[PDB]
């Protein structure tokens, strides 16, 4: 059971994005698309760094996007996290 749990974690992480949940099949239409998406576009480390940056930055100095995300974080509303959507899916017509 412990073995199976470990391979399940590995399989989930390798197949689908942690943030948006879109599988690697969509992203791999571009070569190395899944790794590019998971390391440059939807990196959980990047999200943690953004939360750190928002917390450390002065409230009066937020931009519009920073203020939006900061307010949503204060009410603990997580709709700003991309769920089932991404930049590529949004701009399929123009990017492709």
């Amino acid at each position: 059971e412990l073995r199976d749990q470990q391979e399940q974690v590995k399989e989930d992480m390798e197949t689908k994005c942690f943030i948006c949940g879109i599988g690697n099949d969509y992203f791999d239409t571009v070569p190395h698309g899944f790794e590019t998406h998971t390391l440059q576009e939807h990196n959980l480390a990047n999200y943690l760094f953004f939360l750190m940056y928002l917390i450390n930055k002065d409230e009066t100095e937020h931009t519009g996007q920073e203020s939006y995300v900061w307010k949503m974080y204060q009410e603990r509303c997580w709709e700003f996290f991309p769920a089932g959507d991404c930049f590529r899916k949004q701009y399929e017509d123009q990017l492709n």
């Binding site: 440059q40 576009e41 939807h42 990196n43 990047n46 999200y47 953004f50 519009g64 996007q65 939006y68 995300v69 709709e79 700003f80 996290f81 991309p82 769920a83 959507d85 991404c86 930049f87 899916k89 949004q90």
Partner: peptide
């Protein structure tokens, strides 16, 4: 870089 669901209902 991160991606968010913006205030304009747009990623």
């Amino acid at each position: 870089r991160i991606e968010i669901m913006g205030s304009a209902k747009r990623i």
